[PDB]
Amino acid sequence: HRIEPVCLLVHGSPGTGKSVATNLIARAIAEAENTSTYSLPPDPSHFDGYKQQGVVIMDDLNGADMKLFCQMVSTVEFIPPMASLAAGILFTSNYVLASTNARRFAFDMDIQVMNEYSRDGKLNMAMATEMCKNCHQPANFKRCCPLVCGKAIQLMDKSSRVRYSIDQITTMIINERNRRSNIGNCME
Amino acid sequence: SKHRIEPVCLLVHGSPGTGKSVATNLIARAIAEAENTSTYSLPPDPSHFDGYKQQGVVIMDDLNQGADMKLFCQMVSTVEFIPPMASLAEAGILFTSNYVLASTNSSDALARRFAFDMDIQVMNEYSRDGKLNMAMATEMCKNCHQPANFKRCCPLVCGKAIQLMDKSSRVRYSIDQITTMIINERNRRSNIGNCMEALFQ
Amino acid sequence: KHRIEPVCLLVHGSPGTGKSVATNLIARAIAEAENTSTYSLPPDPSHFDGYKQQGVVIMDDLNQNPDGADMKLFCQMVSTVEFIPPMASLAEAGILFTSNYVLASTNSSDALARRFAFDMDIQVMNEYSRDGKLNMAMATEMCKNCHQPANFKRCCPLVCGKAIQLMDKSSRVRYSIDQITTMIINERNRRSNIGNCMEALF
Amino acid sequence: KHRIEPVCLLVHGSPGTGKSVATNLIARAIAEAENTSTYSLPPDPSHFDGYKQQGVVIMDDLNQNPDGADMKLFCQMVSTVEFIPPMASLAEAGILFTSNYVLASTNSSRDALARRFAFDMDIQVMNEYSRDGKLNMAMATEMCKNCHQPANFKRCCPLVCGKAIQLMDKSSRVRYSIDQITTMIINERNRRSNIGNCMEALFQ
Ligand SMILES: [Zn+2]
Ligand SMILES: [Zn+2]
Ligand SMILES: [Zn+2]
Ligand SMILES: [Zn+2]
DSSP states (O other): OOOOOOOEEEEETTTSSSHHHHHHHHHHHHHHOOOEEEEEEESSSHHHHOEEEOOOEETTTTOOHHHHHHHHSSSSSOOOSSOOOOOOOOOOOEEEEHHHHHOSSSEEEEEEEEEEETTTTEOOOOHHHHSSSSOOSSSSSOOOOOOHHHSSSSEEETTTTOEHHHHHHHHHHHHHHHHHHHHHHHHH | OOOSSEEEEEEEOOOOSSSHHHHHHHHHHHHHHHEEEEEEOOOSSSOOOOOOOSEEEEEEEEEOHHHHHHHHHSSHHHSSSOOOOOTTTTTTTOOSSSSEEEEEOOOOGGGGGGGGEEEEEEOOGGTTTTTHHHHHHSOOOOSOOOOOOOOOOOOOTTSSSSSEETTOOOOOOOHHHHHHHHHHHHHHHHHHHHHHHHHHH | OOOOOOOEEEEEOOOOOOOHHHHHHHHHHHHHHHTOEEEEOOSSSOOOOOOOSEEEEEEEEEEOOTSHHHHHHHHSSSSSSSSOOOOSSSSTOOOOOOSEEEEEEEEEOHHHHHHHHHHEEEOGGGGBBBSSSSHHHHHHHHOOOOOOOSSSOOOOOOHHHHSEEEETTTTOOEEHHHHHHHHHHHHHHHHHHHHHHHHTTO | OSSSOOOEEEOOOOTSSSHHHHHHHHHHHHHHTTTTOEEOSSSSOOOOOOOOOEEEEEEETTTTSOOOOOOHHHHHHHHSSSSOOSSSSSTTTTTOOOOEEEEEEESOOOOTGGGGGGGEEEEEGGGEEEETEEOOHHTSSSSOOOOOSSSSSSOTTTOOOOOSSEEETTTTEEEOOOHHHHHHHHHHHHHHHHHHHHHHHHHH
């Protein structure tokens, strides 16, 4: 009976800051869904630490990966395997976020280090994590910085072709999780 | 990375007619109005927090001092807690409750968790047949002085009908009293917490 | 060879006078200066579960009946002689008590009285007392115009002596948390300068 | 969980091939770069005497003794939890471990411990500087004559610029000189610390 988790992945070259992207997005929707974030390690088979957190992030997806993923983004009741048998909890996460190098991905997006923050083609993290000094307040973040507002990095949808900021991308994922929850409500 | 202040914990012991539920619930609607929240009550022998929307107070009843108590240790803590839900459309909410009140009638590392270990005691004028004369105890109070955590007073508020007695010290408190005692140990840990955060961070 | 005797502080106070926060500020400050952490014993300390040789130890509500246990423990902690605390866990049995500071508060022969390098009464300043209770809310407000504290990054009335002070039960002189906290560190350092030199000489 | 995981380097090599020389070179340059000192643990170490929260710690011959002593300490250090190391001198006990770099050499083949090596590398002596299979130290310490300035050392020698020894990342198989991998390690630590400060601020 469970609903299908909204899903995002982020293709990137290694120095472009896609780990900090997903994590910023995860922590934000988490803050809003009064939940927490579960990280899967790369190449992971067990869910030591899962406790039905509202959002999980999958560092460096992809192949058991493309399998254990498709159990996660499904309507089937699914039971993750454990390390300590201390087993049994359903997987209920309403969001899955992940990174790498087809309809289960409501948000298929490539990244772009903006040029004033490129450093040899790589994201200049020291500069990209300085706080923004002339910005409107973000929609899902307390405060603004260049990773949130689109200065340092942006997400390009392949299909849409459009470019959004992180702040925009989180507003978008929320809404789709709500739609899905809103219909999943009325029916029931 | 521990991030939440452990909640202040009250446990009232007592024989089953003694008002022991009525006390845990009088205190809780008092605190809740003070911090402008709501209450959320757990069933006896409970496993699921369905309907827990991070309201400020949690009531446990019939705590068996133990499934009752394994789950109790996890609420009263600093470490993040994720209540199990039966509904899938809810599972995922973080436990951020400040108070847990529990009642009972009935190993030192768990004891410290009981910030207030009281014994409910029914005063004789309000005890017909050996149990709370609830019709008496609820009648409003005529010349009582204004309570601290209630806008009006009655013989449960003011210790006329019902009083609870610290198991360890042995002194007696009314309901209206032990509320601020609890409100304040919660205000206490808040202000000390912020204070230290600001001096060493 | 042997361990130096932990410099020890005892704060006497009535219940709402803030002697726990007093001892906690002092500990955190000493521990920050010593590059350490703090370890709190629960009242009625039975076990030292979680103790990993944090240089600073806190005993909240010490009962000072010399027949009591609080004081029998206390006399092993505050001594020069190997003391291997009891752990409830046997997966934790064997670590030595090496802490250099012990900070305790209570409500109130000479061999227990030597152990207290500093024996002190806490005093609410009246401007912060709700019927002789520490008005914690306004005492934990940050100060706005204090000089930089000796041992705290920022100042507040709990630190500089606006809200609370500590009176020496002997000399009858009063001290802020900040002042007592450098006397306590100076004392441990004097013990250590002496102990370390005794070692080099032999 | 208040401290940041130290950045961690593991250099595998046979026993004459200069891996000790190479971790000490990296350590010393990282240390200058942060105005700290280095602290060296002995092989199969028990005690941390002399540890004063120097920023770079060094371990050699890790897991040489396969008993476990090496790997418990290692894992306590490459962690996010408070670690109060063991000392032989009682005077010295209780200091907190807070180094940001752990540099280890080994001769072994060692999920959640691999997670701790941010750089897992094999040392390879280039043939011109090999002598009977081991690193020719006397040749390698002669200063380079015509080399661009190195990023992390004041002058260049073949140990630095990749002439004498190289470091091959076991995963990717890419090779790096010492100077390069120093900038990489420094840059990982700064990144960790920049992301950290940002997350605190945004969820502050
Ligand atoms: Zn901005
Ligand atoms: Zn009344
Ligand atoms: Zn001040
Ligand atoms: Zn060179």
